[PDB]
Design a protein around this nucleic acid. Structure first.
Ligand code: ADP
Ligand code: K
Ligand code: K
Ligand code: K
Ligand code: K
Ligand code: MG
Ligand code: ZN
Length: 531
DNA sequence: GGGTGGGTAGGGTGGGT
């Protein structure tokens, strides 16, 4: 990762053009960090990789250079939806652009092929899927003619991490993309990604073969962002009522994003907010382009205060003044949470990120991510973050990314750093043994306990057939009992057992690997609690 | 309502189980 700072200047011959395009065409005041350095390197003919979090402004770094020189820029994109979002932005800006995909008509393909070799064509950006490279010789023939005509002099590979086999959403189509630099060496190539471990970037560079390449990585910490974790109420109605209290009481009239586990959750939450007077609109990539345009148009004009998006893939939410981000359910992984929470405060002003932690959400996410190899492990790391009540959120967040060392001070910008309080180490060894007795009886009774059922037996609720006479009621609030069970599951005193039913995957709790340590009478189990 | 109508699939606040 060579230093961008040498390139953070506007003394270049093209600098006047770059400033002219940025202000007059893109209607943008100032470059965001690493934008200018990335743009200069591409205009210098050098290969560059830009690692920037989603919503950081990656797209400008190759759209602007396209307008600074004659001819068009080839953009490789993996998703049709991603291509559509860029085209809508470009169309609003008056920049000529087009796309090719498998579903594109024969006539449109003919037009795009004609425009590529056309001397006077107005096209500046052409977006194609990697399939059009690997599996269309006809498109390659036009591309070769265009290259020899100097029609196109640069290439952008969005989601460049897909080239590497280790990258998320690795695509066999992306493997073939090395043909580009081999066949068109004179065209500079730029790779854009938001999730980029260093070994992933080097592998992708090998695939493209590109040999020497600048890699610019955005700073991890966002000083203006406030990170908080709140308990999620057991019912679904006081929760939305609580959210409306937060929105009116602290962010009255301010834009914000609500993240939900599922698409139907976003629709359900959107209706609930609307009935309470909050102007809200659901957004997800499953939306038709007309729906996406209307929600984006309404949100930008502040006709809609709150956008309710889905965690799974929701990511056309570009607005510089997002004052708050609220997670209706906890993120799937810490890696996802940083991306989702990082939408807020792109204007660099103070913004709040509130995560609502719920015991039920743990198992709902666990069943979904069962096929993922590390899905449970990534989720359990997220659970640990919610559990913690003393450590600074930035320190906790940093520890989940070995790729970044963040020494920046919190400056009272998280719930734990804020709040001066004292903590003990409450013993919970007795509680763990009591839960084991309930579980052991179930195994002999050949019945599986859901976490809901297991907690019911502990408190004296539920079917009496799943009871131990000697187990006394915890005499603690139910939410506290959920945390104790969650702590045991994290520590592997309990383990999740998954049942595959026809309807859905179901999580059941079972005796964990570490329960045999309870045989030692001197063994103790403790957890942080406020005094 | 019925399970040869289907559950990589429509979803469980649609209802029976
Ligand atoms: N220099 C800048 N100043 C202000 N806003 C910017 C700048 N660069 C990009 N943006 C805005 O950030 C938003 C998100 O950028 P996007 O192209 O989605 O980046 P990414 O590819 O990282 O998601 C866009 O709406 C864009 O208008
Ligand atoms: K843009
Ligand atoms: K049914
Ligand atoms: K039906
Ligand atoms: K049915
Ligand atoms: Mg992007
Ligand atoms: Zn802190």
């Amino acid at each position: 990762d060579s230093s961008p700072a040498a390139w953070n200047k506007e003394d270049f011959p093209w600098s006047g053009k770059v400033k002219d395009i940025l202000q007059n065409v893109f209607k943008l005041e100032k470059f965001r960090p690493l934008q200018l350095e990335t743009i200069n390197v591409t205009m210098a003919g050098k290969e560059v990789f830009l690692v920037m979090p989603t919503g950081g402004g990656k797209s400008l770094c190759y759209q602007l250079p396209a307008l600074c020189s004659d001819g068009f820029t080839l953009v490789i994109c993996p998703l049709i939806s991603l291509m559509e979002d860029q085209l809508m932005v470009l169309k609003q800006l008056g920049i000529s652009a087009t796309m090719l995909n498998a579903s594109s008509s024969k006539e449109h393909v003919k037009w795009v092929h004609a425009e590529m070799v056309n001397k006077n064509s107005e096209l500046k950006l052409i977006y194609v899927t990697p399939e059009k490279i690997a599996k269309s010789k006809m498109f390659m023939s036009r591309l070769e003619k265009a290259y020899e005509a100097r029609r196109f002099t640069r290439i952008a590979v969005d989601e460049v991490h897909c080239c590497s086999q280790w990258g998320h959403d690795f695509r066999p189509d992306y493997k073939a993309l090395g043909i580009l630099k081999r066949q068109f060496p004179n065209a500079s190539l730029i790779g854009l990604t938001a999730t980029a471990t260093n070994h992933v970037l080097t592998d992708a560079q090998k695939i493209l073969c590109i040999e020497k390449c600048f890699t610019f990585t955005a700073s991890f910490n966002r000083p203006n962002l406030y990170y908080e974790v709140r308990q999620k109420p057991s019912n679904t109605e006081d929760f939305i009522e609580d959210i409306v209290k937060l929105i009116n009481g602290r962010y009255k009239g301010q834009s914000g994003i609500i993240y939900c586990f599922s698409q139907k959750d976003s629709e359900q939450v959107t209706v609930s907010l609307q009935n309470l007077g909050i102007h809200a609109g659901a957004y997800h990539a499953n939306l038709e382009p007309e729906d996406k345009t209307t929600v984006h148009r309404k949100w930008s004009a502040n006709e809609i205060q709150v956008v309710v998006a889905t965690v799974a893939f929701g990511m056309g939410i570009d607005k510089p003044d997002v004052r708050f981000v609220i997670h209706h359910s906890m993120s799937k992984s810490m890696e996802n949470y940083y991306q989702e929470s990082g939408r807020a405060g792109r204007d660099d002003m103070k913004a709040d990120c509130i995560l609502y932690y719920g015991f039920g959400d743990i198992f709902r996410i666990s069943s979904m991510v069962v096929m993922e190899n590390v899905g449970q492990q990534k989720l359990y790391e997220m659970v640990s973050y919610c559990q913690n009540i003393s450590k600074c959120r930035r320190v906790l967040m940093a520890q989940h990314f070995d790729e970044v060392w963040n020494s920046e001070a919190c400056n009272k910008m998280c719930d734990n750093c804020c709040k001066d309080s004292a903590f003990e180490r409450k013993n919970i060894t007795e509680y763990c043994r009591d839960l084991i007795k309930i579980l052991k009886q179930a195994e002999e009774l050949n019945e599986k306990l859901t976490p809901l059922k297991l907690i019911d037996s502990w408190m004296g609720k539920g079917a009496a057939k799943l009871r131990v006479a000697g187990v006394v009621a915890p005499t603690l609030p139910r939410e506290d009992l959920e945390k104790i069970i969650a702590h045991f599951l994290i520590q592997q005193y309990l383990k999740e057992d998954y049942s595959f039913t026809a309807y859905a995957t179901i999580s059941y709790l079972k005796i964990g690997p570490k329960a045999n340590l309870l045989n030692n009478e001197a063994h103790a189990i403790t957890m942080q609690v406020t005094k």
